[PDB]
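Limitations

Structures in this collection are predictions, not experimental determinations, and the ligand pose is part of the prediction. Treat each record accordingly. The example that follows, with adenosine-5'-diphosphate as the small molecule, is included so readers can see exactly what is and is not provided: the inputs are given verbatim, and the output is the predicted complex.
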Amino acid sequence: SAVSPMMQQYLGIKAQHTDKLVFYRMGDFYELFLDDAVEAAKLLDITLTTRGQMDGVPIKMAGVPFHAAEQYLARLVKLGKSVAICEQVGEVGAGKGPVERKVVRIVTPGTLTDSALLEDKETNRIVAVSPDKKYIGLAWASLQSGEFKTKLTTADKLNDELARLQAAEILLPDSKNAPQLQTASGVTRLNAWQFAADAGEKLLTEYFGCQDLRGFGLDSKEHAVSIGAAGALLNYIRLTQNLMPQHLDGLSLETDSQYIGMDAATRRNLEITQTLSGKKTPTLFSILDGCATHMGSRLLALWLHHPLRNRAHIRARQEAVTALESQYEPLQCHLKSIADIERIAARIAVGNARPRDLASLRDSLFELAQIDLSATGSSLLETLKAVFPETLPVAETLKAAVMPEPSVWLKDGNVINHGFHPELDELRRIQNHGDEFLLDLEAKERERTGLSTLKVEFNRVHGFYIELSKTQAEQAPADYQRRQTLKNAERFITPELKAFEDKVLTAQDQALALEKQLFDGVLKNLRTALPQLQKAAKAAAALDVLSTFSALAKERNFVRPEFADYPVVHIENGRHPVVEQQVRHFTANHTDLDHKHRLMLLTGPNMGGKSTYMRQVALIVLLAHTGCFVPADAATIGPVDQIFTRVEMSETAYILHHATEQSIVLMDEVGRGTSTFDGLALAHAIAEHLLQKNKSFSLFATHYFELTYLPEAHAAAVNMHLSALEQGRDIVFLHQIQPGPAGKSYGIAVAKLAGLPVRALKAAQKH
Amino acid sequence: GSMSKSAVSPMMQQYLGIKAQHTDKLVFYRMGDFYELFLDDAVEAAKLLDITLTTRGQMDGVPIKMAGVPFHAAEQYLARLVKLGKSVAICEQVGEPVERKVVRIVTPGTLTDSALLEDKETNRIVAVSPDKKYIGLAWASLQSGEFKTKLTTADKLNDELARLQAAEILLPDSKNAPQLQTASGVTRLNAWQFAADAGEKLLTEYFGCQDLRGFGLDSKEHAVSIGAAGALLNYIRLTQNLMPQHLDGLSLETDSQYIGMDAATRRNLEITQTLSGKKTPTLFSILDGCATHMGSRLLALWLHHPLRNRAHIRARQEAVTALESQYEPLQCHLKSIADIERIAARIAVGNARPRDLASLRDSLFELAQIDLSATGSSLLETLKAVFPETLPVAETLKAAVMPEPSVWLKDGNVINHGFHPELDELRRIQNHGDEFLLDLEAKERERTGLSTLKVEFNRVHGFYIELSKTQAEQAPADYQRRQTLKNAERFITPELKAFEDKVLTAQDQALALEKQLFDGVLKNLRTALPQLQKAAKAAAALDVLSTFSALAKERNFVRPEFADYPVVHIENGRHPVVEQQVRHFTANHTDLDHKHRLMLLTGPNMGGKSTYMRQVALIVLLAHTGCFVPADAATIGPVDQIFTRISTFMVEMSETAYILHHATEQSIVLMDEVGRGTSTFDGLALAHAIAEHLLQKNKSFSLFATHYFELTYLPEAHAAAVNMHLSALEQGRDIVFLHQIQPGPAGKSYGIAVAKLAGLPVRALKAAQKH
Ligand SMILES: Nc1ncnc2c1ncn2[C@@H]1O[C@H](COP(=O)(O)OP(=O)(O)O)[C@@H](O)[C@H]1O
Ligand SMILES: Nc1ncnc2c1ncn2[C@@H]1O[C@H](COP(=O)(O)OP(=O)(O)O)[C@@H](O)[C@H]1O
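Predicted complex:
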């Protein structure tokens, strides 16, 4: 009535998606209308205009070009918005008549697989949360890696798990909590019945082809909330991608004991993967990122955030890096030459993979087959040595199937190799007819009338065609009109080449359709081959990060960390990993902590370097529990469960919490603010909780001198410092750890002489 | 050293002739359409400017390294080179016939070209002549005619250097020269150029007077600064094409005319520069509402130089009060004037181009239109009296130059029509150009039967008529023939040789004539330089005062009051920069007298302590500039200096080491948490002693923020001390800071931050109480 049909179908699509933007394919452009038009013209800086009227109202519209579409929608998912992409799709091929217009894929900021949308070091996780009483169900998955885990956690404390997962999207039900909102990033809201164990268990069991989830360690009475979260995640993944991915790892209940505990503020303080200044310059991940492959880098981040508590999964890693120190160079001088086969396997699983990825996967897998000689170690890398079966006709029948240099698009043509399919072969051999047959009928009927020079014509409107001039007019052999338009050199169509295009045009029309058919065919080889791909990518990444761990333990002085059953922290000539590269003249120090030497009270002037030492030992323990070595001569670490580090952030209060038989707690000058009285009191009580009163093992830096007397009260809490000297008219710090307290101090290089005999006086009323 | 010159080309020998005079600078050697540098200059410029390094010719067998820049881009590269502190001699060829000359030396501190200066950029060169007992300072700004001398000391030197922000520093070459940071471009000079007697001769010559008494100098005690000024004048003479006669007077600066502030204080107060060194909201940027560039520069100068003489301050304030009701059309008028100050500078140094005059005359007329615009009663009346006095210059310029002259004087069409009758007649031979050529071509078509001939021209052959070799054989002997081509053949004929010599001769005479007339009006302008400088200064001052009036009207500023007794009274004042960043800013009072001299500020970390102190210091600074202050009312006593500190730790001991034995009864001192570092024993000892120095041995009005609570008990030991703290309120398990000064020391509430805490918090509550 008062709406264009081309708007009626659009509304038919938009009706199903009022919770995300809709890219609507219009010619060589993607366009959005109405509120999508205003919102898209706002989030981006896109010209807003008008095209058409609905009920007598000029409908607004914004547009982007097709060539720059993935860039713009990549900017849209960086903003945390979802976009449904609506194309015109037809049955059989090229639409044997009709065309449908439907949403072919839905792009969400947490289900990303294309290299055009992801940074080559981005980790993309979608986490679903299902809350209720105390415990809450936590389930996360990464499409690009196949990761798919679950976990039970407590209501709030969830924020630390969220900052640990670094989620790019959160799935949430309705009613009650959880809160935070802007402490996550981009939250999409799903129906409550999606989070039902009373449906989730069924969906999961069907997905993995098993009778129960007890094999994955998930019972039904407990865990129910988390199996429901996993079910909701599975549903979302199904609704977003065009194929249901069959590459997901396999459910596992993550225990809150298999990794060392690090809260959000601790992960930010130590600068594991990002700075406090919101960047990626000097982070622990950056100065260790010597991975030849992107997947190895991302895995390096994963290990950097998840150091394990088990005294059996590390030292295996030590048995790898130790056995790699004499063979790591020819491994990276080989791993540098492969591509992101992890994301490639992903795109094959979801179904958004283009031929270039098949080619690159073929090559990188063949190069993965050329490791061979570099092998033989202990336990784990004996598994990695055997994990490459070359990957059989998955690597072999990939070069046999796909060309060395395939086309960019499957609709351009020519992707499958020559001599791979016979009917294909005979259906190609008309590429010489651009040099034959038409030359035959074009020279045999070249100027059978004259004059003059004769040319040929392809044209898109009309079929194959021939040339002519102005004054030269009606000189034809068939002649019978069927001619114009228009004027200025005239044209008469021929009746016998309309049987020539009748076979070459159809020749390509069945060549490309067939090529799509068997491209889908050898695109199906996933019934047995997809897990092979996942295992290949996993082991390749692991070898990359481990060999990188071997390069760093020889180019820089790193030593195998030893372990112990008794709570101990000792290390000789310990160095800070990221600061060691910033000065080119770092001073190695030691730590000396045991059951009777557990708390260290640090003192010293400012630019002396106590923060650097604290972060030094903390990062050293972290690296020791990763598998890599530590910057030292030797280091011994007992058992440890959590690491804590420290606008009156009481979050010191967080130092409580489940299982406090810790071994590492950092406190840097707690007391700044309020006053010296109440600040000193709080620093005193806080310092006393860290020994016997509830907890154990701490590095306590403070300027409070009236607190250096604490070793006189508790023998387990010792006191050390860092000093300064000069050997001249200016004070310099060489940054050496020295036992005992402060302080001179002093000094003063010109502070008159009427405030000096009180600076020495009041600093002698040290009651 | 036996040498060429069969191993060096004559051109290269010329270049070495110029280069031997400038072994310390880059030399731009004019080479056709380019400026080229050779040898080490070529290598250095290749590094610095990212231009490709190449080779031209050979010297002593070795290829000559060369690097060039195109003429049209030269300025751009110069702009880079002076931003790297580099000086460049500009070798051109001059003559009537030609010799190689330097014509101009571009240095970081003698800039007058708009291509090499930002709009709001001050360009100062300062020469220091050290005696050791005292140090003479002389600074000049060519773009403003600024010329001032001062006697300082070695310990107070870097404070002056930081005050002046000089782009270039002239030092003597002696081994006893003062060691210092480097900084800006440091240029060392043949020590003899700092001579006191020679400098006195140079000054008395430049100004046309008998002695330097009127300026307040004379050779006895100011000798070293006289030598500094002499070095400055000599350097200006070496570097500029023409010797500028626009340097205003020469005042000896005393320590008693401006409110003194050290380098650290200028940096911390963020007057014209942030602590991160930007224009991210500073005092200048927040207050810069000037309509002219010269006005903005003057505003920066004023913000760095608050006046001690209250009479001048009050003259300014009268001006802004009078400008309250009339600053809108004033700003509209001044907004359409150009940088006549820099114009006068380029005229002075002999670097003005025709369109510069085309801006000077127009903006001078637009300034003459302000005679209405405003009235009133103050120093304003002098300012208004200045503008109509400069109308004659605008008239002579309206008569002498075109409404829009050409860019280059070498192209003619710069001198106006009707200004010179001989030029009008020489320029009149132009219809006789195209017209005669029509009355010739048409008289050759019918005469040769060829519509295939036109009169053509090139710079090599002149005018000619060309015919194809087919038609060439049929040409008359009336034609004369020259160039032999392939298809055609060119011919002149004496009836267009008379024409050719006629019009080309007229062109040359016209060009030379415009050259000499434009030069004439340039000499006249340079004689009118004092009135031009008065016009520029009057415009800039009026623009700054208009800006102050506008700020007071639109931001609720009030005229501060001045008292004869030590007092700082601010009825809820505001921080001028922070106030435009918070949507809501809480104003706060300040009551200080001889009995209340030291405020001991305490409290949490987000109660506006530092902002309050900076607010007080900034209102006192603004008070002595003529600008109205952000408050309901204010009253400040006699102030001499403003000290502040708002990494560690000897830098703290250094700044305090400056404050304790320099601050006086009239000083305003700001201390922000002194003691951070070392420990809480020694730091509290130092904070204690430092505090008991401002009330006692230098009765300065001090704001002293700290977290040492034991310093709270000073009002119970000193009548001068008082306790104030800033507000913190609990309204819903959540801390808020309403930022309000309250008498007293905030009490104890760090334990009260138990709003998110778990103890066993009594172990702290058992440490305090403890008295
Ligand atoms: N062992 C070391 N070797 C060399 N430089 C160091 C060392 N430890 C610290 N530094 C340097 O000393 C400076 C002060 O570091 P910081 O830990 O902040 O001191 P503090 O914590 O005592 O205030 C840093 O810039 C760092 O570069
Ligand atoms: N009067 C005020 N009105 C509004 N905001 C203020 C005011 N004073 C301070 N603030 C804000 O409070 C913050 C803390 O200022 P600051 O004075 O540095 O606290 P402290 O001195 O306790 O360290 C600043 O970011 C400032 O913007």
